[PDB]
Amino acid sequence: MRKFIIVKNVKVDGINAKSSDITVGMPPATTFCGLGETMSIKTGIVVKAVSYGSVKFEVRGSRFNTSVTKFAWQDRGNGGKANNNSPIQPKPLADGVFTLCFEVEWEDCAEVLVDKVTNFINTARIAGGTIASFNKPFVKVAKDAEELASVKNAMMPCYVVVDCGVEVNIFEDAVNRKLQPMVNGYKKLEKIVDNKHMRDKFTPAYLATPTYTMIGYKMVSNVDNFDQALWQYGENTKVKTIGGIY
């Protein structure tokens, strides 16, 4: 018996927009699907799928150039090189109002799930962002598509994200169809021989390259299937959709 928990109108601030060197703005679906593993490890509630919209979104900067804060001098080897401003490499940030849906199985009363996601919101960060204000979470129960439409009518207004798929490759598809790409998976390239520079020192580490896909921004009152809008872990080191390609 599946359960849905909803984070509505969460104000994210300081979220770095650089999903890749070629996609900037929204963080990839790896971020919001790893949020589920973050509450699966930090809290313990098993999250199987995730979906997200956007009440508002804006990347910090002007119309053709969005850009980056003056960097600090937080490196060793720059002793006399501190009076100058910074070495500045691009890292644009954003701010947005989001809606989040998590697929969880609880097998317990709903008065614990709300507090157990509330105290996790206050300690986690949304891709480097800072939560300012967020509505109180509530638990939704749906057993069919008719009761899943009750979940559909309550996110009004938002702009949800559905998969769209690539025709041949990235920028060609971005041109002729005028759609939006974003990263949906990672391809292993080479294994680092030494683990003394890792943050875990036990798990083997491989270099990765971002694999992209096309999506669609849709009105939440006009989507046929929510499972077309949910996202989850895939294979290998990829994400996908329950409902497949729209």
């Binding site: 927009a17 650089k18 999903s19 890749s20 060197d21 070629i22 996609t23 900037v24 703005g25 790896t30 790893g34 593993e37 956007s54 009440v55 508002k56 979104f57 804006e58 990347v59 900067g61 053709f64 150039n65 969005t66 910074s86 070495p87 500045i88 490499q89 691009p90 644009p92 207004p157 702009y159 990235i170 920028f171 060609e172 971005a174 041109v175 005028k178 939006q180 790409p181 974003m182 990672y186 292993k188 390239l189 080479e190 680092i192 520079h197 890792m198 943050r199 875990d200 798990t203 083997p204 580490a205 491989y206 270099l207 990765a208 390259t209 971002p210 921004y217 872990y233 290998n236 080191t237």
Partner: protein
């Protein structure tokens, strides 16, 4: 071509289709993946402080190797082993994980640490495909700052910067 390739191997001598130099200039990590290279794919180029010798028209090594699969006719091997072996002596693997993002993924019953590094073809095909064929929703960036020629020779060559897509959805009125 032979004299400046010889200058390149006498220099630092690194070619690559994947790097983390674009995320931070302090990267020094370089891998030439093999199976993803197709006929129209493009490759960037690094030597120390972006040095080189022109080909008597102000033309360095990059547009040379980049211009319409020029590299392919040496990589597939119709130009002889004499050029191809000296080309293959330059594509080495260089590993470095400092000042790079280091994230996790849920694999089969466990988690996996992996470093996201950037792609070579995507930036150059972005500068040459969102621009020429009229896509009118993009952000123009320049990396690095006032001295962008520190990263690569791709960084050195065009100073208008690369192009990303806009990820701004329309908002509720």
């Amino acid at each position: 071509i032979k004299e400046m390739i010889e200058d390149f191997i006498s220099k630092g001598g690194l070619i690559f289709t994947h790097s983390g130099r674009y995320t931070n200039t302090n990267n020094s990590c370089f891998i030439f993946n093999k199976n993803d290279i197709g006929v129209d794919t493009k490759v960037d180029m690094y030597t120390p402080k972006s040095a080189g010798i022109k080909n008597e028209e102000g033309e360095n090594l990059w547009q040379v190797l980049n211009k319409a699969n020029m590299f392919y006719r040496i990589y597939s091997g119709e130009l002889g082993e004499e050029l191809q072996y000296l080309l293959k002596s330059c594509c080495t693997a260089k590993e470095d994980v400092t000042t790079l993002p280091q994230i996790y993924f849920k694999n089969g019953e466990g988690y996996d640490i992996l470093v996201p590094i950037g792609n070579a073809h995507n930036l150059i095909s972005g500068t040459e495909y969102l621009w020429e064929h009229k896509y009118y929703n993009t952000f123009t960036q320049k990396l690095g700052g006032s001295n962008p020629q520190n990263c690569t020779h791709a960084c050195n060559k065009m100073r208008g910067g690369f192009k990303q897509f806009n990820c701004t959805p329309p908002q509720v009125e």
